[PDB]
Design a binder for this molecule. Structure first.
Ligand SMILES: Nc1nc2c(ncn2[C@@H]2O[C@H](COP(=O)(O)OP(=O)(O)O)[C@@H](O)[C@H]2O)c(=O)[nH]1
Ligand SMILES: [Mg+2]
Length: 169
């Protein structure tokens, strides 16, 4: 069956692990070690296609930088996550965008921008500012809550759809 290799990136604490675990296991994890990096696989149906999602939940620095370059080169699409109550996490998106493009040496890399923690009252990044950034990149923007599951399937399935559009060219 078709496999899609997805990589979830973003600053520490934005909800990469909580988003991934909601997708895979359908529960919200309140506490998951910020230093754990692991991969998960799940069979899903997207637009009638039975496929396997192979998802790497990243944790930042690696023992050796070659390990970062390896997952960036093999990954087919990237979920770039910030938290709507953490402006620094939003600013860091610029760094992830640039680094992934540089490792892959490509200007066309399937990516989706995710603003997580949308259930929280505290917000420092309004939707408009994130829409403006996504428009500048030419990629979709989705607001999510790993707690309530709002937008979770959409974020991952939209990324698969972006990979499909890239592959058909
Ligand atoms: N309220 C709320 N809390 C969240 C959400 N996503 C993650 N969290 C919490 O934010 C903290 C960091 O989440 P985590 O998944 O460990 O972030 P990571 O470092 O990016 O993997 C944890 O305490 C989670 O419970 C969300 O959508 N809403
Ligand atoms: Mg984590």
């Amino acid at each position: 069956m078709t496999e899609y290799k997805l990589v979830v990136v973003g600053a520490c604490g934005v909800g990469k692990s909580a988003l991934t675990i909601q997708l895979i296991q359908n529960h919200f994890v309140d506490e998951y070690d910020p230093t754990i990096e692991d991969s998960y696989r799940k069979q899903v149906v997207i637009d009638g296609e039975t496929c396997l999602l192979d998802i790497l939940d990243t944790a930042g620095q690696e023992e050796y930088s070659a390990m970062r370059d390896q997952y960036m080169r093999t990954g087919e699409g990237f979920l770039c996550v910030f938290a709507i109550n953490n402006t620094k996490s939003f600013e860091d998106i610029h760094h992830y965008r640039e680094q992934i493009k540089r490792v892959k040496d490509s200007e066309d890399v399937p990516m989706v921008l995710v603003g997580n923690k949308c259930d929280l009252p505290s917000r420092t990044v309004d939707t408009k500012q994130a829409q403006d950034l996504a428009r500048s990149y030419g990629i979709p923007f989705i607001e999510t809550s790993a707690k309530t599951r709002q937008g979770v399937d959409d974020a991952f399935y939209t990324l698969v759809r972006e990979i499909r559009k890239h592959k058909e060219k």
